[PDB]
């Protein structure tokens, strides 16, 4: 309320001061960012100071702006900011406070987190070995790759020589074909052999993404078909959840639990009659998916469910670890705070790097994950500070050369005493004595074109850079005069003369022609064109006919 008393005093007295506002303010905030916000609000309020000094005379005397409908909202913002709570300001501090709710240690709890990660990858790996189109995709890639339409080392990123991989491709080919060539006597044994021959291989992450995306599309197909079934039965016929799932569960393959269900003498059966064909199509795509794969749609669901749960566990372990290591990222990113980039940009590059570190960690070499990910963080932030810091972007090797020059410049600037010359840098460095000129030309920033060149009334460097490409009005007038002159000159010829001498040039037309088209016009792609052109050139060379033209000669 007292800050409202500051408001009324600012209304009456006609100003305030840093001491006045700092007196009335609500205690216990004092971040000096909330303060700057509230001072900007009081400025936006009726008060227009904010002061330091009380006055003020004839120099801009008796100033005021009503600014109605801003006072009622500004004073409202004040009374609300004081009464409720103190709001955070900026976003670096947002990030700090929001991550400070992270329990900031995993002293060998990293082992459990990596345990969960391995759980996810291994459940999805069982999904991999069990997904038929996975092995068919591998076999298809093998054939495409062998012919030479693709590489073996591009598809799979090593097991736990591409000929070893290829004989293994044939081994798994025989495994998968023997799995498929028993259509129900030994199918479980077959899948067992297939899984235990495929569960020590590996692929590119993008090949695995393609596998998972064909899998996700399979799921999307099955989900659209279950829509076609249930949203067309239940939500189209008053066939409720219980009376639909009584026949939708367990077998979930045959058309009977829909068609014969139509005949069970029920209201939903008396409403499904026109949706009969639509759900028939639904179960037909479902059994065609069956045709596709070989496993029931319920096995489809169970497999993708296990995959999804492993994926969720792995993502959650990733999240938990990254929340932990955000502190590490902040600590390591503090060390580049004026490279030409923001603190938050550095720490976001670090976030990306830490994510890659998580994705490429293993305890099977006994690492300590903190110092492991420190490298990835520093490398990603270095790559970023190189790539997207300079205004005009210079490449990575060029930035390495530039920092080499700076290191050697410092070393020489206290070895030689005064400073080094390019001729001396081209022998401490071993560059060609000209690349150093180009490097130390290039590696400097640009000047800010709103730089204050305060040597005037009030100016800017931008207001002094003239325009170079504009054509002088003298030039434009001369051009128009020359057009008129040469037009009258060319009128001072014959029709055939003027036509050929316009065409072989670009005068009063589009771009200028060739002797081929000159001949396609005047019937003679031959010396008639040359005759006319050169003879008219001679004719216009006549002084007393081209004297004005040669007066158009800027010599």
């Amino acid at each position: 309320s007292q800050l409202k008393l500051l408001v009324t005093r600012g209304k009456e007295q006609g100003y305030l001061t840093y001491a006045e506002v700092n007196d009335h303010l609500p205690e216990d905030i004092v971040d000096s960012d909330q303060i700057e916000d509230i001072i900007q609000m009081i400025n936006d309020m009726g008060i227009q100071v904010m002061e330091e000094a009380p006055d003020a005379d004839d120099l801009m005397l008796a100033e005021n702006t009503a600014d109605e409908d801003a006072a009622e909202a500004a004073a409202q913002v004040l009374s609300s900011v004081e009464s409720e709570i103190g709001r955070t300001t900026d976003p670096v501090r947002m990030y700090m406070r929001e991550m400070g709710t992270v329990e900031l240690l995993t002293r060998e709890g990293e082992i459990d987190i990596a345990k969960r990660i391995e759980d996810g990858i291994n459940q999805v790996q069982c999904s991999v070995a069990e997904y038929p189109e996975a092995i068919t995709y591998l076999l298809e890639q093998y054939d495409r790759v062998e012919a030479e339409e693709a590489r073996l080392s591009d598809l799979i990123t090593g097991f736990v020589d591409p000929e070893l991989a290829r004989e293994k491709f044939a081994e798994l080919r025989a495994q998968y074909v023997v799995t498929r060539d028993t259509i129900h006597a030994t199918a479980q044994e077959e899948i067992l052999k297939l899984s235990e021959v495929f569960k020590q291989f590996r692929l590119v992450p993008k090949q695995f993404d393609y596998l998972v995306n064909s899998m996700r599309v399979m799921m999307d197909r099955v989900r659209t078909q279950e829509r076609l079934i249930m949203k067309l039965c239940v939500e189209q016929c008053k066939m409720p959840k219980k009376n639909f799932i009584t026949l939708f569960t367990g077998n979930e393959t045959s058309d009977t639990w829909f068609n014969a269900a139509i005949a069970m003498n029920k209201p939903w059966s008396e409403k499904l009659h026109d949706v009969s064909e639509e759900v028939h199509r639904a179960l037909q795509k479902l059994q065609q998916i069956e045709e596709e794969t070989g496993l029931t749609i319920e096995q489809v669901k169970d497999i993708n469910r296990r995959m999804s749960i492993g994926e969720a566990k792995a993502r959650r372990a990733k999240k938990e670890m990254v929340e932990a290591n955000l502190r590490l990222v902040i600590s390591i990113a503090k060390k580049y705070t004026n490279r030409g980039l923001q603190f938050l940009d550095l720490i976001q590059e670090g976030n990306i790097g830490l994510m890659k570190a998580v994705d490429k960690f293993e305890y099977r070499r006994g690492y300590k994950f903190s110092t492991y990910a420190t490298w990835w963080i520093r490398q990603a932030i270095t790559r970023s500070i190189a790539d997207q810091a300079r205004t005009i972007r210079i490449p990575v090797h060029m930035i390495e050369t530039i920092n080499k020059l700076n290191r050697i410049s410092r070393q020489m600037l206290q070895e030689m005493g005064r400073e080094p010359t390019p001729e001396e840098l081209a022998e401490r460095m071993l560059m060609p004595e000209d690349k150093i000129r180009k490097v130390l030309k290039i590696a400097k920033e640009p000047i800010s074109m709103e730089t204050p060149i305060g040597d005037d009334e009030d100016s800017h460097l931008g207001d002094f850079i003239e325009d170079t490409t504009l054509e002088l009005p003298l030039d434009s007038a001369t051009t128009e005069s020359l057009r008129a002159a040469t037009h009258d000159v060319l009128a001072g010829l014959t029709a055939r003369e003027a036509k050929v001498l316009r065409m072989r040039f670009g005068i009063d037309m589009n771009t200028d022609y060739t002797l081929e088209e000159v001949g396609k016009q005047f019937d003679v792609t031959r010396e008639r064109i040359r005759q006319i052109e050169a003879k008219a050139l001679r004719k216009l060379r006549h002084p007393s006919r081209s004297e004005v033209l040669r007066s158009f000669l800027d010599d």
């Binding site: 840093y18 001491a19 700092n22 007196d23 303010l25 205690e27």
Partner: protein
Amino acid sequence: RRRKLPATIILRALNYTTEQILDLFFEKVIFEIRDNKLQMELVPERLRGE
């Protein structure tokens, strides 16, 4: 330039209590009761123009 405060707060924080504060920032005028109704000490300079 932070908030204002009662200026005696710094003096109390300097290991001063109220008695020695008052006897730092004031002279003294005594009052007595010598057999009758609140006698007074009176230096000639004290009561100028009142």
